[PDB]
Design a protein around this nucleic acid. Structure first.
Length: 231
DNA sequence: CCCGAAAGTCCG
DNA sequence: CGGACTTTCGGG
């Protein structure tokens, strides 16, 4: 079965505009986990737009197929493009897609893909269907996969006044002992972000509960100005 | 334009 | 450890 023609067209068009000179530092920035073509976001977005203009966006029946096929290509720009395409199908994504999104999180995993899946796509789903959180979050925390653990921490990132504080702090308590940078930093980020909505609750939490030094320092990067640094 | 964010390197 | 500094990206 041939590659979907839309994916083949995107592959051809991106490859024709590759930049091996830029690809080297781009690959180093992601710790050489991926090959890169060397195409930065503004041009990558335009090249995708070119292909949509010529071919049209595929029928929604092929949405998941297109994403998978791009996910399977070696160069990282294809995963970035896949996420751009998934946004174009946003109004068609619902709670039945949680396993599909899980599988994206745990394949070709790094912060650049996971952070573009979790607080947006998964965040929106669990905001509408909070009763499903307990069908996934406990498994994610218990798993050996750090990207699922990060997903558990960051899916509420943008919730603001809709943050479930008890849940957030429970999740952080489960993961506070992790020695993994991407977990410590995710804890820092979600606390720093939530502190923009409720600084008193974040300050009290970090002063009275154990956290890795990195997590605490990142959490209070801004709000330490509001409370002061005691001698 | 601006700022804040993931990251990243380099240094003490 | 954590501060100083870097580019790239998203949003105001």
């Amino acid at each position: 079965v041939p590659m979907h023609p839309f994916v083949k067209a995107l592959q051809e068009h991106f490859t024709a505009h590759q930049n091996p000179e830029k690809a080297e530092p781009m690959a180093r920035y992601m710790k050489n986990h991926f090959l890169f073509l060397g195409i930065q976001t503004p041009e990558r977005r335009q090249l995708l737009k070119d292909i949509i203009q010529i071919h049209t966006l595929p029928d929604q029946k092929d949405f998941q197929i297109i994403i998978r096929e791009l996910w399977d290509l070696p160069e990282r720009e294809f995963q970035a493009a896949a996420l751009d395409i998934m946004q174009k199908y946003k109004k068609h994504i619902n709670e039945t897609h949680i396993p599909f999104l899980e599988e994206l999180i745990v394949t070709k995993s790094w912060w650049d893909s996971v952070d573009s899946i979790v607080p947006t796509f998964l965040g929106d789903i669990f905001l509408k269907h909070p009763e499903l959180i307990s069908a996934y979050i406990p498994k994610w925390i218990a798993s050996d996969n750090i990207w699922l653990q990060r997903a558990a921490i960051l899916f509420q990132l943008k919730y603001k006044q809709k943050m479930d504080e008890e849940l957030l702090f429970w999740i952080i308590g489960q993961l506070h002992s992790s020695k993994e940078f991407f977990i410590q930093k995710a804890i820092g980020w979600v606390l720093r972000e939530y502190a923009k909505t409720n600084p008193d609750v974040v300050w009290e939490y970090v002063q009275n509960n154990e956290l890795a030094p990195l997590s605490k320092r990142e959490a209070i990067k801004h709000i330490k100005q509001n409370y002061g640094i005691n001698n």
